């Protein structure tokens, strides 16, 4: 019963739900406030655990009351925390999020600049035989490239059912990340990255970025209310319409819900078309709920 490893960020999300987006220099009372475990790779673990998958998290944490709460939340959700890279120096990332109840918008201000990242040296200790899928949240690209090369070396010595499946996510429009396109069987590219590169649709983004992926890889792009699209080695464009809820209340973590649902579906042997549909269905349902718990 092999696990799914998600390598990336874990952050304390201090979420304020408001009735209207605040105007600069004003004071208001929130409708509600919650302290939620966040970060793209950590949120993928939450969704994977809710779907019934055995999953592990690999990311950095600094000792303190914040890390204890985040670890206690991971444990309660049954996410394995043995690969956590404990840092003697630095600060656990923390974000302040504004969730607008009226349209489901999420405005994030993140503090994640004072913590050493998972190194290639740290990743060298990971027993790759306990994982069937490794998802890397694109962050410190130069070190993560070495982590991806290690999996490639491992998989070349393994028979087809013993090969670890690899997915990569390019979510932030940072130049350094673009070297990660070349790795993984599944590459997730955000609407934000695509729009920053000049793309006005998911189909445009897939055609424009496919030459960057590994030979035989599938490029995946979710475009919010326009749905989600994919392009694999057969050159066929795949699409699923979005499944918006009756009332969009919380879009915070919707992207991760999509990524984790696609990984879940693909790891179970479903096709890319089935994974695209499932991804839109689960993230769609998530957009009509506060947090993640109501998806199942």
Ligand X SMILES: CS(=O)(=O)c1cccc2[nH]c3c(c12)CCCc1ccc(CN2CC[C@](O)(c4ccccc4)C2)cc1-3
Smaller CB distance to ligand X: residue 123 or 223? 223
- Under the binding rule (CB under 6 A), the answer on residue 24 touching ligand X is yes
Q: Which stretch binds ligand X (CB under 6 A): 39-47, 129-137, 151-159, 283-291?
A: 283-291
Q: C-beta of 243: minimal distance to a copy of itself in Å?
A: 20
Q: Which does 287 bind (CB under 5 to 8 A by kind): a copy of itself, ligand X, none?
A: ligand X
Residue 280: φ, ψ to 5°:
-70, -35
Is residue 113 a contact point for a copy of itself (CB under 8 A)? yes
- Work out whether the CA dihedral 156, 48, 227, 173 comes out positive or negative: negative
Q: Is 224 in the site for ligand X (CB under 6 A)?
A: yes
Helices 40-51, 65-76: inter-axial angle, 10-degree rounding: 30
From the list a copy of itself, ligand X, none, which binds 210 (C-beta under 5 to 8 Å, kind-based)? Answer: none
**Alpha-carbon span 227 to 221, nearest angstrom:** 9
Which of the choices a copy of itself, ligand X, none does residue 255 contact, using the CB cut-off of 5 to 8 A by kind? ligand X
Contact range with a copy of itself by CB under 8 A, out of 19-27, 36-44, 208-216, 280-288: 19-27
Q: Among the candidate windows 103-111, 125-133, 196-204, 213-221, which touches a copy of itself by CB under 8 A? A: 103-111
How many other β-carbons are positioned within 10 Å of the β-carbon of residue 184? Answer: 23
Smallest distance from a copy of itself to CB 26, Å: 6
Does position 98 bind ligand X by CB under 6 A?
no
* Residue 11 zone, left/alpha/beta (φ > 0; ψ -120 to 50; rest): beta
The correct pick among 62, 81, 110, 242 for binding a copy of itself (CB under 8 A) is 110
Q: Are 149 and 164 in contact (CB under 8 A)?
A: no
H/E run at residue 176: none
Q: Tell me how far apart the alpha carbons of residues 17 and 34 are, in angstroms, rounded to a whole number.
A: 9
Are 255 and 225 a contacting pair, CB within 8 Å? Answer: no
DSSP letter (8 states) at residue 94: E
- Choosing from 12, 61, 136, 280, the residue that interacts with ligand X (CB under 6 A) is 280
User: What is the x/- site pattern for a copy of itself, positions 249-288, by CB under 8 A?
Assistant: --x-------------------------------------
Q: Give the pair of three-digit tokens for residue 268.
A: 């179970």
């Amino acid at each position: 019963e092999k696990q799914i490893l998600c390598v990336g960020l874990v952050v304390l999300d201090i979420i304020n739900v408001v009735d209207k987006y605040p105007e600069e220099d004003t004071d208001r009372r929130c409708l509600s406030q919650r302290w939620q475990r966040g970060g793209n790779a950590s949120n993928s673990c939450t969704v994977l655990s809710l779907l019934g998958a055995r999953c592990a998290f690999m990311g950095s944490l600094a000792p303190g009351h914040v890390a204890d709460f985040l670890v206690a939340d991971f444990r309660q959700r049954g996410v394995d925390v043995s690969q956590v890279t404990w840092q003697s120096q630095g600060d656990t990332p923390c974000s302040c999020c504004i969730v607008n109840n009226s349209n489901g918008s999420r405005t994030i201000i993140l503090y994640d600049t004072n913590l050493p990242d998972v190194s290639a040296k740290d990743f060298e200790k990971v027993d790759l035989t306990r994982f069937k899928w490794i998802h890397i949240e694109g962050r410190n690209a130069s070190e993560q490239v070495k982590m991806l090369q290690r999996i490639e070396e491992h998989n070349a010595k393994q028979p087809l059912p013993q090969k670890v499946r690899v997915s990569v996510e390019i979510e932030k429009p940072r130049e350094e990340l673009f070297q990660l396109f070349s790795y993984g069987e599944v590459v997730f590219v955000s609407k934000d990255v695509a729009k920053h590169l000049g793309f006005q649709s998911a189909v445009e983004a897939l055609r424009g970025l496919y030459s960057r992926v590994k030979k035989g890889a599938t490029l995946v792009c979710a475009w919010a209310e326009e749905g989600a699209d994919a392009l694999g080695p057969d050159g066929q464009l795949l699409h699923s319409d979005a499944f918006p809820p009756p009332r969009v209340v919380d879009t915070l973590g919707a992207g991760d819900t999509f990524n984790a649902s696609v990984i879940f579906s693909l790891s179970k042997g479903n096709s890319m078309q089935e994974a695209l549909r499932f991804g839109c269905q689960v993230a769609g349902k998530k957009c009509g709920l506060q947090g993640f718990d109501g998806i199942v």
